[PDB]
From a paper:
Bacillus subtilis BsDyP belongs to class I of the dye-decolorizing peroxidase (DyP) family of enzymes and is an interesting biocatalyst due to its high redox potential, broad substrate spectrum and thermostability. DyPs are a family of microbial heme peroxidases that display structural features analogous to chlorite dismutases with an α + β ferredoxin-like fold. In BsDyP, the heme cofactor is partially buried in a predominantly hydrophobic pocket lined by the conserved proximal ligand H326 and catalytic distal residues D240 and R339. Access to the heme from the surface, as defined using a 1.4-Å rolling probe, is made through a distal tunnel and an open wide cavity.
Residue numbers in the entry:
A (entry chain B): 56 to 111, 117 to 308, 322 to 414
B (entry chain A): 56 to 308, 322 to 414
């Protein structure tokens, strides 16, 4: 059966096996009272449990389910929730009395020299990561979740992505043709995931069992890359394209990252969205998503090192950025982020 | 294996089993000499045959100072029933009053821009095109890899006009797929396994220039679907829009329900559409989604245009939809082994 458990010590969709498709939405809270947010997450919890477990009538009422996934398998559907800095303090105002529960490292990522950030393509009070092996299943889940948020939230953006693994289980390849994900530690090793991803202490209690999610929308210049020689492509990463093996002003991508001595859990997706109206070429890139218990220690040093000397900067540009705090898992009978009181 | 034959009496991707994902691109020809077009389709034929089959680009002793012949992101993927369908729009034969490449005598009978409809809101940049490429596969990464490498060969001869992409998931037990309104979509289609019906609805046998023999016409309509308005409507209003029950699809007895209004024309087409999403619409703040309506018919004047006239006038579905792009293409007959696509370019 293609069912991933929703309840647990941790949220699914983080160490869960990498599905093929993602829908990534961010929302801004427009409700005034925290009680409205409680109702939203209570209904989101009930709906998510129904959608992920495989669960499938008044004619005068609108359909509670939009119905386009009625005959489809759950397809390993997972839904992951997180909170941005604006959820705790907006324009200097503590809107829901949550200042005492703000995570240690929850803040907007520092500016980088080569950034070209669109403010409308990043940030957000709440993030929803919807993953499934079937895009129609993934969109159906996000669509029905967002319909519940009417009156309390405004949808900020909706991104979608794909990533296909090898037919025999090989490491998936990004849009540059290189194997992507080899540097990750095994998600099946609880000891390694507890040291890299999961939070055990030092944070507010609702973060116990949670993690931080970093989001970077990275445009990839496909037309420039495809015109480059194989040598230039392999020199950009410092790895052979087919095998991924190491061979041997700017530094190769992979060795530059390792020089920081830090580790994160990358769980990214490729994306394509028609022709870019300003360039006339395919609009494509990477929905970079990573999980780490401490972004200040693990993730920001990578941004600093790459933003300075990465040869990959010639073929990429970050246009959106966000950092979210993901709560711990939901116990059966509880709702997501129940430390909203 | 998930391999669909590229060569044949007909092009694949028309009566072929409906794959899950599509990339739909249109291109405008900027080259002046017909010889440049011949080279383009000769290379497209070679590349498509490789992509659709299990063949992979082996450049073992390649030159590292040359660009890779293949972009490489499908190296470890199965063909995933990849099909590539080519077609020609009216602009391929006449642009700004000029008879292009001396092909006026081979222009198909019914190849012309679709007539304007009252409820149309057509963006000229979201329709038309001299050449269409429909790339379908059960794996989106396989489909995009095919389109990307096909478009890379067109540099110098064509400019890409638009690239659309879509999805459509069939039931786990083979049930008819459901569109984004939750209704089963495709029941009205005749069986693609019935050669007699496909010959009467889709395939051209005579009456057209020889290169159209074994081909068909492809109609394209980009139809935005108002999900937020639809989702706030009652189930009865949703079912009254189509005249069919939502779960079962069963029929039940100025606005006319969609299906009975279509049936009143007495015509048949082969619908092969895909749903689409592109994030939030910057103009509405809601999800930008709809249907990439793709249909195949041997005579669009007889089979398809009467449907457009009937629907644009009385369709209750017009309350929840709006067409924003339109195009008509003439698809050549199949390519025989040893030939190249539409080789009636001489
Ligand atoms: C378009 C953007 C990017 C592309 C195409 C890309 C591609 C790659 C590739 C091919 C590898 C080697 C294989 C692997 O381990 O995955 C790699 C390694 C890695 N990259 Fe990137 N990357 C991108 C952006 C980033 C960013 C923005 C970060 C961090 C802020 C990052 C962090 C890492 C890490 C941690 C590794 C593993 C290094 C190790 O072996 O320990 N990547 N990347
Ligand atoms: C967003 C746009 C549309 C949606 C959601 C839609 C949906 C449907 C549905 C649910 C059915 C009944 C089940 C089926 O037979 O597939 C149907 C029937 C049909 N529709 Fe549409 N439709 C759309 C646009 C169009 C357009 C623009 C045309 C033609 C110009 C068209 C032609 C047909 C045909 C030929 C049938 C089959 C009629 C029969 O039973 O013989 N559809 N459509």
């Amino acid at each position: 059966e293609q069912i991933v458990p929703f309840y647990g010590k941790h949220q699914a969709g983080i160490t869960t096996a990498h599905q093929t498709y993602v829908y990534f939405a961010a929302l801004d809270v427009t409700a005034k009272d925290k009680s409205d947010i409680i109702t939203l997450f209570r209904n989101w919890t009930s709906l998510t449990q129904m959608l992920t477990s495989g669960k499938k009538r008044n004619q005068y009422l609108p359909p509670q389910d939009t119905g386009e996934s009625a005959d489809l398998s759950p397809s390993n559907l997972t839904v992951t929730f997180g909170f941005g800095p604006g959820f705790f303090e907006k324009d200097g105002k503590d809107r829901f009395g949550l200042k005492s529960k703000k995570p240690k490292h929850l803040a907007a990522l520092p500016a980088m020299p080569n950034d070209n950030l669109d403010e409308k393509q990043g940030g957000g009070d709440i993030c929803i990561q919807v993953c499934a092996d079937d895009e129609q299943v993934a969109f159906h889940a996000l669509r029905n979740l967002l319909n519940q948020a009417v009156g309390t939230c405004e949808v900020r953006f909706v991104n979608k992505g794909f990533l296909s693994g090898g037919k025999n289980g090989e490491t998936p390849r990004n849009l540059f043709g290189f194997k992507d994900g080899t540097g990750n530690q095994s998600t099946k090793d609880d000891t390694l995931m507890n040291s890299i991803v999961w939070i055990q202490s030092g944070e507010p209690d609702w973060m116990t069992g949670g993690t931080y999610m970093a989001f970077r929308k990275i445009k990839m210049f496909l037309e420039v890359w495809d015109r480059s020689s194989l040598k230039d492509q392999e020199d950009t990463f410092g790895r052979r394209k087919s095998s991924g093996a190491p061979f041997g002003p700017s530094n190769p991508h992979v060795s530059l990252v390792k020089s920081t001595g830090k580790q994160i859990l990358r769980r990214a997706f490729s994306y394509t969205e028609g022709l870019d109206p300003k360039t006339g070429y395919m609009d494509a890139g990477l929905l970079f998503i990573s999980f780490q218990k401490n972004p200040d220690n693990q993730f920001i040093p990578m941004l600093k090192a790459l933003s300075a000397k990465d040869a990959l900067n010639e073929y990429t540009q970050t246009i959106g950025s966000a950092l979210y705090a993901c709560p711990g898992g939901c116990k059966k009978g509880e709702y997501i982020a129940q430390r909203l009181l």
